[PDB]
Amino acid sequence: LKIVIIGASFAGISAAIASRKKYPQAEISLIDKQATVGYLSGRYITEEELRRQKIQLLLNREVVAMDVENQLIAWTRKEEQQWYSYDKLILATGASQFSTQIRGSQTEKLLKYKFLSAVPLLENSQTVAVIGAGPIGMEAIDFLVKMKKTVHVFESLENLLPKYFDKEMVAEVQKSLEKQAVIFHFEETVLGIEETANGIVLETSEQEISCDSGIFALNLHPQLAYLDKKIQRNLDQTIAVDAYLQTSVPNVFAIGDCISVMNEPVAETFYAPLVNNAVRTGLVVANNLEEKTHRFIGSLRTMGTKVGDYYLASTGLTETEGLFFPQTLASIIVRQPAPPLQHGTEILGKLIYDKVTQRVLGAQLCSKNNCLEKINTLALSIQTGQTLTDLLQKDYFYQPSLTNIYDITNLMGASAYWREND
Amino acid sequence: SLKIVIIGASFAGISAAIASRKKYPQAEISLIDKQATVGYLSGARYITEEELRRQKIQLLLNREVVAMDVENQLIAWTRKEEQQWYSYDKLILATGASQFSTQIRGSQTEKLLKYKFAVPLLENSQTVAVIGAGPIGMEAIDFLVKMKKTVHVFESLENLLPKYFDKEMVAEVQKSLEKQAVIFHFEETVLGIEETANGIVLETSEQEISCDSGIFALNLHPQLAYLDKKIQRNLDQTIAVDAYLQTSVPNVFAIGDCISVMNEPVAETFYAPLVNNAVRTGLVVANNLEEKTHRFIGSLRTMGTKVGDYYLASTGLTETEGLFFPQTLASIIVRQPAPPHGTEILGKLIYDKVTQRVLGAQLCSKNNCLEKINTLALSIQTGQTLTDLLQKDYFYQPSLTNIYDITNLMGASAYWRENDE
Ligand SMILES: Cc1cc2nc3c(=O)[nH]c(=O)nc-3n(C[C@H](O)[C@H](O)[C@H](O)COP(=O)(O)OP(=O)(O)OC[C@H]3O[C@@H](n4cnc5c(N)ncnc54)[C@H](O)[C@@H]3O)c2cc1C
Ligand SMILES: Cc1cc2nc3c(=O)[nH]c(=O)nc-3n(C[C@H](O)[C@H](O)[C@H](O)COP(=O)(O)OP(=O)(O)OC[C@H]3O[C@@H](n4cnc5c(N)ncnc54)[C@H](O)[C@@H]3O)c2cc1C
Ligand code: NA
Ligand code: NA
């Protein structure tokens, strides 16, 4: 069996490794347009580790073409094209193509994040623009605040990390950052950028702002030129796959940032470019290369980070995006002093559930205490179809010096349950 | 005007009271307890009488229930050596763990202390004995080591926290304590205790050990003398209940420590007097006083603690516990350095070899990863397979987690390992 994987990153390396365990005999090739793979960027595994695991790393080769019916792909190394055949093809190409509707976005003064590899332009900057307040955006605001720069943040949605939190859950986080030369512009889109000799002017749907330079923190898209046209694609240009991560054509699969994941209990498609989706989809394709053995469970955009002094975690549907779903969403917020027997710092928890079915659909957490791991529990609760009643009584552990009497996770479900009984 | 009466104003009882109020804003709710005060911890106030009072919860303290009549629905208590009767529409039994019970000869010695019932007897002792290496015993040892006493630990099972960990998982914690004058006697049961003028001698299945005093760290049982003999009970004396927490008689329910809980997947009925079992059964029973609406999920004996520099957590069946079940169980150990190069996180996963259903987990590390046990517990209690655990959602962030969560990894490792075979 010849398993060929295009993309030697999180998704691809996971698929490679997972494939090696399933098929100890199979010939496995990992292809990538880079000099070396194995490290995080802007060193979790060594080429020797892939090698010890009988995985051929064909680097410096950029895939440029495909032939689905003859089952071949073509890469271009040292100016010379070369075709390669496959029995199974796994697309783990990620998303790095910069595609915007911003006029004059090709300014060298507008840094495109992932390509980051601090930098002269930023150090010589006093005021910097950040386009996008998603996870990538907040990371940039963080490093810019450390460098003591003035920051202008542009976000089309209502609040910071909009796809993960509802306004009230991060209102304090924003104020916190506002006291640190961070200036927010929500519900404002960057329409164009004028390059001056010593800076840039962001032309938004509301005004013009001056900055010395800018960081593009919006989600990039999959560079899928090499893609065979017979392969079904989604409107947003991601590759369409079924619950087994197979493309619309025989012997070709796609994982990670290539595809659009699904939040099943609410059967809706969305693009969640996260490391956990990359690792999970990769480990799973490996068991569906010949037979539809294990359905991908889907994604809930589960995330956890730290913005300043605040630990923030999120998973599932936000109440805000509930306007676009059939479920009648309801929510409750719980405040409970941190685990040292309710004496510690406040922990804010929001739970989103279906008001009719009482199924848990989303959760948000904000605190100065690092309780982030609880998001993995809340995520599991939603992913297994629990109701307020189930969450309310799930097992949890108590220890007078380590926890509170009743876990905030269980309490979130109970509080919602009680409120639903008037 | 439903009159709900709750005997026992502790974790279980107070939870039932709170929950009963939520469900019945217009109900008469009485909380009865033989103590003077309520809402204090043990082992500094988690609820004030003023609080329960504000929720219209009739606090009837200094009253000890000594009898009840199921047929006519009444209970009787002794206040100031004068009996009194009280009626109820719904009665919730939430008394706790008090009764001292053991077949040890001479256990009546005054030199053998019962944990929970700076002590003179212990400070005058240089060598103290602890009977039981369960959670209660591990705390006594902790207390004793801090007082710099020499400790002799007796445990019928194979290792410390036997109902929570298999031998290899706590081997380093044992050595850790043995450097602090703790001497362990596993697979050794105390048969009798001889009292001397200045100490005790413990007759064991293997030898005789001298100590100045001893601590009984075995689980105490519910004081159910007042119980109407009409209520069905288990062999260990706990009160039997159906999935909705009702006893075998009309309008009487039992929760917390009076009760035995279940691990449905393996059809195991056991006694696990834990605060989490007390609180959950208390909140659930309040919804089944009339119609059976919500089945109590049961318990996995989920636990988390810290011994020395070690954080230990457990949930479900240990490999050793599994040997007691017909179903064949397997396990795998996973060592993952903590995030970002950090200290080792050691986890063991127990699963059904045939169905690949996750059934138990154990964690040990110098890193506080205990919360991960709540997640593993949810995986088991929810019926996940190794495959489900392998791909469950988890969050990643370079400064806080590893690339692939150890919880997911433990499931994947078992899956892959099973594939090799
Ligand atoms: C600044 C930033 C911060 C982020 N922070 C987080 C975070 O904190 N937590 C989190 O979960 N996620 C985070 N992400 C998202 C995460 O990095 C992605 O979800 C993840 O990289 C996806 O993995 P992948 O393997 O699918 O794609 P990639 O990691 O992009 O790998 C794809 C590989 O394919 C190769 N390739 C592409 N096209 C071709 C071709 N035509 N021919 C040959 N090879 C090709 C590339 O060289 C690349 O190595 C962040 C992203 C950015 C940009
Ligand atoms: C040393 C020690 C350490 C422990 N550590 C932990 C731990 O770390 N984590 C954990 O989860 N659990 C721990 N536990 C167990 C935990 O304390 C119990 O599971 C919990 O207290 C049970 O709650 P309950 O409300 O059912 O009973 P209890 O808390 O025992 O309360 C019963 C109440 O009923 C009253 N009562 C009894 N009889 C009568 C009567 N006849 N009439 C009127 N009132 C009566 C009593 O006054 C008492 O207040 C520990 C126990 C001990 C001894
Ligand atoms: Na909706
Ligand atoms: Na067995």
PDB file of C-alpha atoms and ligand atoms in Angstrom, chain A residues 398-400, chain B residues 7-13 32-35 43 63-66 94-98 115-116 136 139 223 226 255-258 273-276 278, ligand 2:
ATOM      1  CA  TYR A 398     -13.785  17.041  45.810  1.00  0.00           C
ATOM      2  CA  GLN A 399     -10.781  17.836  48.011  1.00  0.00           C
ATOM      3  CA  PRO A 400     -11.082  20.681  50.562  1.00  0.00           C
TER       4      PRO A 400
ATOM      5  CA  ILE B   7     -32.891  14.145  58.291  1.00  0.00           C
ATOM      6  CA  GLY B   8     -29.228  15.181  58.327  1.00  0.00           C
ATOM      7  CA  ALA B   9     -28.022  18.731  57.658  1.00  0.00           C
ATOM      8  CA  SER B  10     -24.776  17.967  55.903  1.00  0.00           C
ATOM      9  CA  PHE B  11     -23.546  17.787  52.305  1.00  0.00           C
ATOM     10  CA  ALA B  12     -26.267  15.447  51.119  1.00  0.00           C
ATOM     11  CA  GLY B  13     -29.074  16.915  53.219  1.00  0.00           C
ATOM     12  CA  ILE B  32     -33.301  18.041  61.075  1.00  0.00           C
ATOM     13  CA  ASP B  33     -29.952  17.407  62.756  1.00  0.00           C
ATOM     14  CA  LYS B  34     -28.737  16.208  66.153  1.00  0.00           C
ATOM     15  CA  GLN B  35     -26.015  18.872  66.197  1.00  0.00           C
ATOM     16  CA  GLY B  43     -11.428  16.024  58.215  1.00  0.00           C
ATOM     17  CA  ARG B  63     -32.858  16.949  67.651  1.00  0.00           C
ATOM     18  CA  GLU B  64     -31.869  13.306  67.317  1.00  0.00           C
ATOM     19  CA  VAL B  65     -34.159  11.033  65.332  1.00  0.00           C
ATOM     20  CA  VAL B  66     -34.675   7.763  67.208  1.00  0.00           C
ATOM     21  CA  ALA B  94     -29.302  11.880  54.701  1.00  0.00           C
ATOM     22  CA  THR B  95     -27.589  10.800  57.926  1.00  0.00           C
ATOM     23  CA  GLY B  96     -23.886  10.143  57.470  1.00  0.00           C
ATOM     24  CA  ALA B  97     -20.920   8.039  58.445  1.00  0.00           C
ATOM     25  CA  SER B  98     -20.585   7.637  62.225  1.00  0.00           C
ATOM     26  CA  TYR B 115     -10.840   9.718  62.677  1.00  0.00           C
ATOM     27  CA  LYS B 116     -13.543  12.443  62.638  1.00  0.00           C
ATOM     28  CA  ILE B 136      -8.857   8.703  55.282  1.00  0.00           C
ATOM     29  CA  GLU B 139      -4.624  12.035  55.517  1.00  0.00           C
ATOM     30  CA  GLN B 223     -26.006   5.284  62.150  1.00  0.00           C
ATOM     31  CA  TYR B 226     -34.008   4.976  64.005  1.00  0.00           C
ATOM     32  CA  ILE B 255     -29.019   9.836  49.704  1.00  0.00           C
ATOM     33  CA  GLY B 256     -25.348  10.398  50.515  1.00  0.00           C
ATOM     34  CA  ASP B 257     -23.629   8.153  53.021  1.00  0.00           C
ATOM     35  CA  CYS B 258     -26.810   6.182  53.944  1.00  0.00           C
ATOM     36  CA  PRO B 273     -19.113   7.843  50.978  1.00  0.00           C
ATOM     37  CA  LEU B 274     -17.704  10.855  49.140  1.00  0.00           C
ATOM     38  CA  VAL B 275     -18.744  14.493  49.087  1.00  0.00           C
ATOM     39  CA  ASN B 276     -19.364  14.358  45.351  1.00  0.00           C
ATOM     40  CA  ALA B 278     -23.452  13.241  48.663  1.00  0.00           C
TER      41      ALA B 278
HETATM   42  C1  LIG C   2     -10.886  12.196  57.537  1.00  0.00           C
HETATM   43  C2  LIG C   2     -11.898  12.214  56.406  1.00  0.00           C
HETATM   44  C3  LIG C   2     -11.509  12.784  55.152  1.00  0.00           C
HETATM   45  C4  LIG C   2     -12.403  12.825  54.056  1.00  0.00           C
HETATM   46  N1  LIG C   2     -11.998  13.374  52.859  1.00  0.00           N
HETATM   47  C5  LIG C   2     -12.814  13.441  51.745  1.00  0.00           C
HETATM   48  C6  LIG C   2     -12.367  14.004  50.513  1.00  0.00           C
HETATM   49  O1  LIG C   2     -11.202  14.473  50.404  1.00  0.00           O
HETATM   50  N2  LIG C   2     -13.211  14.042  49.419  1.00  0.00           N
HETATM   51  C7  LIG C   2     -14.496  13.538  49.492  1.00  0.00           C
HETATM   52  O2  LIG C   2     -15.257  13.571  48.487  1.00  0.00           O
HETATM   53  N3  LIG C   2     -14.955  12.996  50.664  1.00  0.00           N
HETATM   54  C8  LIG C   2     -14.149  12.931  51.794  1.00  0.00           C
HETATM   55  N4  LIG C   2     -14.642  12.347  53.042  1.00  0.00           N
HETATM   56  C9  LIG C   2     -16.052  11.816  53.101  1.00  0.00           C
HETATM   57  C10 LIG C   2     -17.147  12.891  53.231  1.00  0.00           C
HETATM   58  O3  LIG C   2     -16.902  13.653  54.423  1.00  0.00           O
HETATM   59  C11 LIG C   2     -18.548  12.222  53.273  1.00  0.00           C
HETATM   60  O4  LIG C   2     -18.761  11.459  52.063  1.00  0.00           O
HETATM   61  C12 LIG C   2     -19.672  13.258  53.392  1.00  0.00           C
HETATM   62  O5  LIG C   2     -19.536  13.931  54.651  1.00  0.00           O
HETATM   63  C13 LIG C   2     -21.061  12.608  53.303  1.00  0.00           C
HETATM   64  O6  LIG C   2     -22.074  13.598  53.417  1.00  0.00           O
HETATM   65  P1  LIG C   2     -23.518  13.334  54.120  1.00  0.00           P
HETATM   66  O7  LIG C   2     -24.267  14.626  54.040  1.00  0.00           O
HETATM   67  O8  LIG C   2     -24.166  12.156  53.419  1.00  0.00           O
HETATM   68  O9  LIG C   2     -23.167  12.799  55.634  1.00  0.00           O
HETATM   69  P2  LIG C   2     -22.436  13.577  56.876  1.00  0.00           P
HETATM   70  O10 LIG C   2     -21.608  14.705  56.328  1.00  0.00           O
HETATM   71  O11 LIG C   2     -21.759  12.519  57.728  1.00  0.00           O
HETATM   72  O12 LIG C   2     -23.682  14.236  57.684  1.00  0.00           O
HETATM   73  C14 LIG C   2     -24.687  13.470  58.366  1.00  0.00           C
HETATM   74  C15 LIG C   2     -25.437  14.387  59.346  1.00  0.00           C
HETATM   75  O13 LIG C   2     -26.560  13.709  59.901  1.00  0.00           O
HETATM   76  C16 LIG C   2     -26.671  13.998  61.305  1.00  0.00           C
HETATM   77  N5  LIG C   2     -27.322  12.807  61.951  1.00  0.00           N
HETATM   78  C17 LIG C   2     -26.845  11.544  62.029  1.00  0.00           C
HETATM   79  N6  LIG C   2     -27.727  10.761  62.678  1.00  0.00           N
HETATM   80  C18 LIG C   2     -28.776  11.543  63.017  1.00  0.00           C
HETATM   81  C19 LIG C   2     -29.997  11.327  63.692  1.00  0.00           C
HETATM   82  N7  LIG C   2     -30.306  10.085  64.168  1.00  0.00           N
HETATM   83  N8  LIG C   2     -30.871  12.374  63.875  1.00  0.00           N
HETATM   84  C20 LIG C   2     -30.581  13.625  63.407  1.00  0.00           C
HETATM   85  N9  LIG C   2     -29.417  13.865  62.752  1.00  0.00           N
HETATM   86  C21 LIG C   2     -28.499  12.844  62.541  1.00  0.00           C
HETATM   87  C22 LIG C   2     -25.256  14.319  61.777  1.00  0.00           C
HETATM   88  O14 LIG C   2     -25.213  15.259  62.854  1.00  0.00           O
HETATM   89  C23 LIG C   2     -24.552  14.822  60.510  1.00  0.00           C
HETATM   90  O15 LIG C   2     -24.465  16.263  60.431  1.00  0.00           O
HETATM   91  C24 LIG C   2     -13.743  12.294  54.196  1.00  0.00           C
HETATM   92  C25 LIG C   2     -14.134  11.722  55.454  1.00  0.00           C
HETATM   93  C26 LIG C   2     -13.225  11.682  56.553  1.00  0.00           C
HETATM   94  C27 LIG C   2     -13.705  11.056  57.857  1.00  0.00           C
END
